[PDB]
């Protein structure tokens, strides 16, 4: 398997007019965002609770039932801002975590916003998943939440395929995020698309991913997009 | 985030 993720170019947002600029905007939006939850959640702090409680409730399903069991030994979690994630989803559920996150200032607050239980985070990568490679046979969980949007549709692609060289026996990725009602949407403001359901899983699925298990969030606030969770390997 | 409907 090619460590790069490499595959062949298919679909594309022809919503995202310029590729540099589409990643040097978010970098840019991201480096002055403030390092607290409320930054994390553009506004929608209050419903991080009701998050954690539906991604606990699809990932234990994968560590407690089965014949062949996800393990808990590691977790990578993707596009990990200051930890709100790997704080009350991960760490509770895995010896240790790793993060990986574009902005040094949210790592950088990740240490004192993960407090004790922080001391089990082995790793904190700084790198656009763009350009980051998981070590191979690593992971029990690779959580992908809110990030996908910021990358291209091939960038995406090959992240994934790097992220399956990476997984433990076992071991599953998943990618939680809004969904679009129908194609792709740019958001000008922190230069993200959002994707519709058929669009996303027609990336997962042709590069190479097998999608396990699809489940919409339920009681999120009429007025935001669609969320949904996959689990994929 | 999760965002409002544009």
Redesign the interface.
Known sequence: HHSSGLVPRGSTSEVIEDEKQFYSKAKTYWKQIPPTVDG?????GH?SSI?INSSRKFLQRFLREGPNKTGTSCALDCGAGIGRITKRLLLPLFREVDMVDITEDFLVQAKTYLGEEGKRVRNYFCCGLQDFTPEPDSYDVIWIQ?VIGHLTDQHLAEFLRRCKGSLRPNGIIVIKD?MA?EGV?L?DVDSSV?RDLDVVRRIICSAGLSLLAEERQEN??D???H?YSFALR | PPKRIA
């Open positions: 994390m959640l553009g506004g929608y419903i998050d809110w809004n009602q949407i958001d959002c999120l606030p007025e935001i997009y969320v």
